[PDB]
Structures are given as structure tokens and as C-alpha cells.
Amino acid sequence: DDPIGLFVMRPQDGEVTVGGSITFSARVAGASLLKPPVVKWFKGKWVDLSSKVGQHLQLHDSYDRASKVYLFELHITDAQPAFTGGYRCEVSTKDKFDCSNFNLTVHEAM
Numbered sequence: 001d002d003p004i005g006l007f008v009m010r011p012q013d014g015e016v017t018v019g020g021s022i023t024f025s026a027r028v029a030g031a032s033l034l035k036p037p038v039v040k041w042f043k044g045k046w047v048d049l050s051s052k053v054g055q056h057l058q059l060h061d062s063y064d065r066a067s068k069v070y071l072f073e074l075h076i077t078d079a080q081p082a083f084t085g086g087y088r089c090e091v092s093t094k095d096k097f098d099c100s101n102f103n104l105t106v107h108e109a110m
């Protein structure tokens with residue numbers, strides 16, 4: 001892993017109620033590389049985003065070259081009580097490897 005800093009900013013957990021929202025933000029270094037960082041997300045206790053990324057979970061991609069950050073925004077609202085996030089963000093670029101582990105505790109009742 002070269003001095004990329006692939007994990008510029010790492011998304012964190014969150015405790016939310018089912019019916020609210022949750023928000024994650026992942027900032028990945030859009031440095032000079034073989035090819036732009038491939039950051040694969042993993043959503044809550046079992047999920048993927050790559051498929052679901054739409055209306056309740058928008059896994060956005062911001063692209064700041066000058067910042068050298070691809071900011072993948074998670075706009076994930078309305079966390080199902082079985083959504084208890086194990087969101088894993090694992091980017092794999094050139095030789096840089098970085099990963100995050102952040103949960104979403106969806107509070108059904110308590």
C-alpha cells in the first residue's frame with residue numbers, strides 16, 4: 001500500500017429508530033493509481049448496497065479530484081429493525097487497502 005490514504009475519512013456507526021434515518025459518509029482517496037479506487041460497500045447485518053442503492057439507501061458517489069476524494073454518501077433512511085447495520089466499507093485500489101466496520105443499531109422499541 002502506497003501513500004494514497006485510501007481511507008481519507010471513514011464512516012461510523014449509528015443508533016437509529018426504525019422509521020428514522022441513518023447516514024454514513026465514506027471518503028476515499030481518488031489518488032493516482034492503476035485505476036480509480038474500487039470501494040465496495042456492504043450494508044447492515046446481511047445486506048449489500050450495490051443492489052438496494054436507490055430510494056431508501058442512496059449510496060452516492062461524490063468525486064472531488066482536487067480533494068482526491070470520492071465521497072460515497074449513504075443516505076439510508078428508514079432502517080428496518082432487522083437492518084442492524086453491519087455496513088462494511090472496503091476499498092481496494094492499486095496496492096492500498098483500507099476498510100471500515102460501522103454498525104447501525106435500529107431501535108425497534110428500545
